[PDB]
Amino acid sequence: QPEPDMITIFIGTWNMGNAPPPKKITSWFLSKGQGKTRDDSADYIPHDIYVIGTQEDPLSEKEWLEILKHSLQEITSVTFKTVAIHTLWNIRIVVLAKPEHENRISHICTDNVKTGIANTLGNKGAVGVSFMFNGTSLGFVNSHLTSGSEKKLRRNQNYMNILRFLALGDKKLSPFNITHRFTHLFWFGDLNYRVDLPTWEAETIIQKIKQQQYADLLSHDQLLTERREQKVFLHFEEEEITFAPTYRFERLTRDKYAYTKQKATGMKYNLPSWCDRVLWKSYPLVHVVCQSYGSTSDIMTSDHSPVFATFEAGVTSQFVSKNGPGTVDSQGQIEFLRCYATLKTKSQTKFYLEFHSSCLESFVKSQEGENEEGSEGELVVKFGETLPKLKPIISDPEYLLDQHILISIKSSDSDESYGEGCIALRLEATETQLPIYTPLTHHGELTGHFQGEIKLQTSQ
Numbered sequence: 369q370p371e372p373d374m375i376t377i378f379i380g381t382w383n384m385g386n387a388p389p390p391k392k393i394t395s396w397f398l399s400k401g402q403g404k405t406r407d408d409s410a411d412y413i414p415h416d417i418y419v420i421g422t423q424e425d426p427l428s429e430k431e432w433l434e435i436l437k438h439s440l441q442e443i444t445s446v447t448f449k450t451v452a453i454h455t456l457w458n459i460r461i462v463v464l465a466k467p468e469h470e471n472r473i474s475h476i477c478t479d480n481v482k483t484g485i486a487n488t489l490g491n492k493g494a495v496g497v498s499f500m501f502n503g504t505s506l507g508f509v510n511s512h513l514t515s516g517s518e519k520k521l522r523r524n525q526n527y528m529n530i531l532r533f534l535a536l537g538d539k540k541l542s543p544f545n546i547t548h549r550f551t552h553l554f555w556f557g558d559l560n561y562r563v564d565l566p567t568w569e570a571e572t573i574i575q576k577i578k579q580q581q582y583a584d585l586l587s588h589d590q591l592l593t594e595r596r597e598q599k600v601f602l603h604f605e606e607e608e609i610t611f612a613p614t615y616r617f618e619r620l621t622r623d624k625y626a627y628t629k630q631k632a633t634g635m636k637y638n639l640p641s642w643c644d645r646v647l648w649k650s651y652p653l654v655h656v657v658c659q660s661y662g663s664t665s666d667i668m669t670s671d672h673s674p675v676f677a678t679f680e681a682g683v684t685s686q687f688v689s690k691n692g693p694g695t696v697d698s699q700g701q702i703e704f705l706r707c708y709a710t711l712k713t714k715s716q717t718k719f720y721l722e723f724h725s726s727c728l729e730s731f732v733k734s735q736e737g738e739n740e741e742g743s744e745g746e747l748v749v750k751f752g753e754t755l756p757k758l759k760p761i762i763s764d765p766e767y768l769l770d771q772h773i774l775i776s777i778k779s780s781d782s783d784e785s786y787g788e789g790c791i792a793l794r795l796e797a798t799e800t801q802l803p804i805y806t807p808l809t810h811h812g813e814l815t816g817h818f819q820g821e822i823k824l825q826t827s828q
């Protein structure tokens with residue numbers, strides 16, 4: 369039975385509005401309703417992994433697992449295995465997988481972050497799950513961010529706190545936050561970004577939604593505009609939105625948006641908004657294709673409609689050779705030529721690099737680079753031809769070209785990372801000097817760039 373080189377992943381996010389679900393929610397898992405929907409001809413074909421994020425979830429873990437498993441079994445006739453379930457307050461993540469994947473899945477981690485201080489600590493934050501699927505690391509974040517049209521900055525702060533403090537994935541990757549720990553990272557939830565138009569335009573917005581004319585609404589979506597200004601979700605992807613705003617509905621119909629200020633809303637307007645979102649970030653040159661992104665039309669217990677997104681995701685096998693794992697393969701080497709980091713920092717310490725990769729026995733520390741002044745004020749750290757030769761565990765090009773090198777640039781004085789990035793080994797050529805490039809982030813904000821050349825030697 370061969371190991372897969374692709375899997376499909378279902379991502380669901382639903383703010384349940386503290387109400388039990390209706391008896392049938394199969395449309396969610398089938399990617400049926402509005403937007404980019406799944407072909408009818410696929411309905412019996414199970415996804416390999418289903419990741420369900422809920423917010424304002426009133427159910428016990430047991431109650432929700434019984435509804436989810438029984439839903440998937442009715443669709444697929446497959447009894448899914450529970451990989452992980454983690455709840456913070458009313459924020460919940462469930463990971464279900466096909467039984468054939470039980471012995472492909474390992475290194476399961478769960479964590480949560482509570483966002484805010486005093487007043488603002490008590491119901492918002494994130495849950496997450498990570499695991500290995502054969503040679504591929506997968507991370508999943510369900511966040512319920514701060515509500516309110518006038519709190520986009522708070523939401524951006526919630527995002528930074530979650531990506532700094534959520535403890536998922538390989539703890540040996542110590543310089544790296546969750547935005548670098550995974551081959552594929554899916555971040556979804558009630559992100560709570562609103563359509564930023566005047567309150568007096570509510571009925572005009574509703575009109576536009578009834579005509580399925582979303583362009584003038586999406587141009588004011590705070591998540592799209594904040595992302596375009598690099599304020600949040602830097603280096604994440606989102607599929608084009610082609611479904612109506614998923615909030616705020618009158619319960620038990622989808623015919624009415626309930627936007628007017630009420631005591632129950634803290635006297636706040638809730639203009640129709642795309643609160644409920646799925647974004648991802650995969651390592652460079654790994655296959656990931658969104659095959660659905662939409663909302664259900666027939667699940668109306670909440671003031672939110674469920675959102676679905678499905679993905680094809682490239683996966684690799686758990687590679688064994690004569691040599692590695694357990695030793696190096698002298699027929700393999702990674703060389704870095706003419707490398708330099710450009711940092712936005714105003715500081716003057718020496719810097720060194722750390723190279724982290726599952727293709728190495730352990731991370732590699734470089735010598736300190738040479739600081740120069742850039743023409744436009746910047747710090748340029750020159751490594752030249754000084755970077756150490758990396759000794760992969762396996763030289764087979766079928767393995768090595770599928771790998772990635774995480775780079776941290778660290779202060780010699782503090783050993784603190786100033787920037788993290790990632791280089792794909794999926795090169796156009798081996799035994800050939802080729803340009804490489806990564807942006808550098810810290811706490812998920814741009815801090816610089818790393819560029820140079822790579823020369824990859826494999827056994828072929």
Ligand SMILES: C[C@@H](Oc1ccc(Cl)cc1)C(N)=O
Binds near residue numbers: 469474476
């Ligand atoms: C790894 C962990 O649990 C799993 C693994 C795979 C699946 Cl599909 C479900 C649960 C264990 N052996 O306890």
